[PDB]
């Protein structure tokens, strides 16, 4: 997020009461979990800052739906090493 | 009305240059150069014999003024009620200004601070607790006026001079000192301002040093120009040592409201020495016995339990107590401002953890890598 | 039915809050927006008109739309208080008209200046060479007061369209309390 990334929310707060944002990455060099999401709150400081209006992250993941299961799980056809059991978790154990 | 300004327009020599400008202000129907020029004629340092006369013309201005922000009404009304100084005829005029303004800027806040500014006369208890309260609830969604918080904080400090309150001055003084950087005055107010800030906020309840204000870098010239016993004894409170010498040197310097707060502040440093004796030791074999507490805090045996359970009541320690040895167990330390050696210890121990996690993870990965495959 | 997209720029600056013009400056420039929107509607119904301001922020109150109903709504309660903003006013209007769809339509803008501006001459001459390299004609219709016998706008329109520009003008404000139709009577003819 850069400095101008508050004014978009400050426009469309008059549409959604808590206008939540989503930060992604189109370039999958991220070996972390994409689809970051913030939300703007206020945390007004002991130093007497008037109003600090800061975005704060609430956690995120990728959910499931029955039809999109058919879609995604057919669009892969690529990799399946899991044989889900004692070793479907060990790749993520390196991770 | 033009004759009403001609008759008071004749005021002397030279000054009629801008008086003859004033007799062309209203003719062109400009209302912002007229705003700044009313600010000029009223900001004009005189005895101001003409403001109590021209205030009828200011009503004449308010007739077909009809859009202009009443911040100029504040900037005239300060000298106006400074000329009047009458609690009878000015409160009615104040309520008239309170009802006759409906502009998009918040003017009810400047009306409540006019109530406060004429509450400077009398009534520092009457409706203060009630009508101070509404103003910051009207101070919403734009605190960046900073005149509203200044004029609100002035009556908030007057509410601190409602004797039975101590932490309010500290709490809102941090707000005002946060919203002012240079105090844009002839400097001599700042020295006693930060001086009584030091005094009163040091007489606060939960605050002990909070050395973010000891490293507040706009009162640093004040800390060089204040009588530096106060800055030094604040460095002793930050240093937390019981230290009878400088904490008696403040009893040498500050005589009022230190005898009445003396046992309080010494009790506060008796509980403050804990959260430094646990910070000095590197948090591994740190179960403290009675002796070093009774040596630092210099209090007797059957008072250290009160001393630790007071901090447990407050919550600036999160430990427990055995008393067969009077070992007070430590599962806590206070987050403290990062110094240079703290910077270095941070980076070094953080790297120490990081390379160990990496070196063991690489061995796990390589040992079970080819079965992942 | 000539091709442009007329970008009206309203003037809700704080010096427009007086009544030196006919009732209120806001109402006279509002009727000026009425006559220019119907004038460019009769000039072409294909072209469309959104509005923009020079307030605290240059807000896109209206997207570039052919209908004037939202124009009629947004010319009311305009909050005519705030510092003038011009130099990035060119930039926000220009990128607003690079958010168009038919880029064969001219980037024609009208500017309403009724307050003393604090522009730098080098900033506006970077804007001058910029708009030379951007194919834009702006006729600026001055209002109210400024540094009187208005300055840097003569400079900006003179540096804007030298060497066969003939598309950008500068309608200075007549400093007399005149009817708004007399103020637009020369701009209703041509630039």
Strand-helix topology:
The structure is cut from a larger assembly and holds chains A (about 100 residues), B (about 375 residues) and C (about 190 residues).
Chain A: H1 7-12, E1 38-42, E2 53-57, H2 66-75, H3 90-94
Antiparallel strand pairs in A: 1-2
Chain B: H1 2-7, H2 16-28, H3 33-43, H4 51-63, H5 71-84, H6 89-99, H7 108-119, H8 128-131, H9 133-138, H10 147-160, H11 167-179, H12 188-202, H13 220-225, H14 229-239, H15 246-253, H16 262-272, H17 274-280, H18 290-296, H19 304-314, E1 320-321, E2 328-329, H20 340-367, H21 369-372
Antiparallel strand pairs in B: 1-2
Helix pairs in contact in B: 3-5, 6-7, 7-10, 10-11, 11-12, 14-15
Chain C: E1 7-9, H1 25-43, E2 51-52, H2 69-74, H3 87-96, E3 107-113, H4 121-132, E4 136-142, H5 153-160, E5 170-171, H6 180-184
Parallel strand pairs in C: 1-2, 1-3, 3-4, 4-5
Helix pairs in contact in C: 4-5
Write a concise synopsis of the structure shown.
Chain A: This is 26S proteasome non-ATPase regulatory subunit 7. With 373 residues, chain B is mainly α. Chain B contains 21 helices and two strands.
Describe this structure in words.
The PDB classes it as hydrolase. The entry lists the keywords 26S proteasome, ATP-dependent protease, AAA-ATPase, peptide-unfolding channel, 20S core particle, hydrolase. The entry is titled "Nucleotide-Driven Triple-State Remodeling of the AAA-ATPase Channel in the Activated Human 26S Proteasome". Chain A is 26S proteasome non-ATPase regulatory subunit 7. This is part of a larger assembly, with chains A (95 residues), B (373 residues) and C (191 residues). Chain A has 95 residues and is of the alpha+beta class. In chain A, 22% of the residues lie in helices and 11% in strands. The longest helix of chain A has 10 residues, at 66-75. Chain A starts with 6 loop residues before the first helix and ends with a helix. Chain B has helices at 2-7, 16-28, 33-43, 51-63, 71-84, 89-99, 108-119, 128-131, 133-138, 147-160, 167-179, 188-202, 220-225, 229-239, 246-253, 262-272, 274-280, 290-296, 304-314, 340-367, 369-372; strands at 320-321, 328-329. Chain B has a two-stranded antiparallel sheet with strand order 1-2. In chain B, β1 and β2 (328-329) form a beta hairpin. In chain B, α10 (147-160) runs antiparallel to α11 (167-179). Chain B is elongated. With 191 residues, chain C is α/β, with parallel strands linked by helices. In chain C, β4 (136-142), α5 and β5 form a beta-alpha-beta unit. In chain C, α4 packs parallel to α5. Chain C is globular. The A-B interface holds A 45-51, 81, 87, 90-91, 93-94 and B 143-144, 146, 149, 174-179, 210, 212, 361, 364-365, 368-369, 371-373.
């Amino acid at each position: 997020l850069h400095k101008n990334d508050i004014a978009i929310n400050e426009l469309m707060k008059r549409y959604c009461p808590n206008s939540v944002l989503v930060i992604i990455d189109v370039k999958p060099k991220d070996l972390g979990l994409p689809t970051e999401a913030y939300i703007s709150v206020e945390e007004v400081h002991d130093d007497g800052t008037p109003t600090s209006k800061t975005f704060e992250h609430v956690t995120s993941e990728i959910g499931a739906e029955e039809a999109e299961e058919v879609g995604v799980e057919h669009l892969l056809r690529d990799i399946k090493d899991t044989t889900v059991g004692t070793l479907s978790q060990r790749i993520t154990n390196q991770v | 009305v033009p004759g009403f300004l001609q008759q008071s327009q004749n005021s002397g020599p030279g000054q009629p240059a801008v008086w003859h400008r004033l007799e062309e202000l209203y003719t062109k129907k400009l209302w912002h150069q007229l705003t700044l020029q009313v600010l000029d004629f009223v900001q004009d340092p005189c005895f101001a014999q003409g403001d109590g006369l021209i205030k009828l013309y200011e009503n004449f201005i308010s007739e077909f003024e009809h859009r202009v922000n009443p911040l100029s009404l504040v900037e005239i009304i300060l000298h106006v009620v400074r000329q009047m100084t009458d609690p009878n005829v000015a409160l009615t005029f104040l309520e008239k200004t309170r009802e006759k303004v409906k502009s998009s800027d918040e003017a009810v806040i400047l009306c409540k601070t006019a109530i406060g500014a004429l509450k400077l006369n009398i009534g520092d208890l009457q409706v203060t607790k009630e009508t101070i309260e509404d103003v910051e609830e009207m101070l919403n969604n734009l605190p960046g006026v900073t005149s509203v918080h200044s004029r609100f904080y002035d009556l908030s400090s007057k509410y601190y001079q409602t004797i039975g309150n101590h932490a309010s001055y500290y709490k809102d003084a941090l707000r005002f000192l946060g919203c002012v950087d240079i105090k844009d005055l002839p400097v001599s107010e700042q020295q006693e301002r930060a001086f009584t800030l030091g005094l009163a906020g040091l007489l606060g309840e939960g605050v002990f040093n909070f050395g973010e204000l000891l490293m507040h870098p706009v009162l640093e010239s004040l800390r060089n120009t204040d009588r530096q016993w106060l800055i030094d004894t604040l460095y002793a409170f930050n240093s937390g040592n019981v230290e009878r010498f400088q904490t008696l040197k403040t009893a040498w310097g500050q005589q009022p409201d230190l005898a009445a707060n003396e046992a309080q502040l010494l009790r506060k440093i008796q509980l403050l020495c804990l959260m430094e004796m646990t910070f000095t030791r590197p948090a591994n074999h740190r179960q403290l016995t009675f002796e070093e507490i009774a040596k630092s805090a210099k209090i007797t045996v059957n008072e250290v339990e009160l001393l630790v359970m007071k901090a447990l009541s407050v919550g600036l320690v999160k430990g427990s107590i055995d008393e067969v040895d009077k070992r007070v167990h430590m599962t806590w330390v206070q987050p403290r401002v990062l110094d240079l050696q703290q910077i270095k210890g941070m980076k070094d121990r953080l790297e120490f953890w990081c390379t160990d996690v990496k070196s063991m993870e690489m061995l796990v990965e390589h040992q079970a890598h080819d079965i992942l495959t | 039915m000539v091709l442009e997209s007329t970008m009206v720029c309203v003037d809700n600056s704080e010096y427009m809050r007086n009544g030196d013009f006919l009732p209120t400056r806001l109402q006279a420039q509002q009727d000026a927006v009425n006559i220019v929107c119907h004038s460019k509607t009769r000039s072409n119904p294909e072209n469309n008109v959104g509005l923009i301001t020079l307030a605290n922020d240059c807000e896109v109150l209206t997207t570039l739309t052919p209908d004037t109903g939202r124009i009629l709504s947004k010319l009311h309660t305009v909050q005519p208080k705030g510092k003038i903003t011009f130099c990035t006013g060119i930039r926000v209007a220009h990128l607003a008209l690079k958010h168009r769809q038919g880029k064969n339509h001219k980037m024609r803008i009208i500017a309403f200046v009724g307050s003393p501006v604090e522009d730098n001459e080098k900033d506006l001459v970077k804007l001058a060479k910029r708009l030379k390299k951007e194919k834009v004609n702006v006729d600026i219709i001055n209002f109210g007061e400024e540094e009187v016998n208005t300055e840097k706008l003569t400079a900006f329109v003179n540096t804007l369209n030298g060497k066969d520009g003939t598309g950008s003008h500068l309608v200075t404000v007549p400093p007399g309390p005149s009817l708004a139709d007399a103020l637009i009577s020369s701009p209703i003819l041509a630039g």
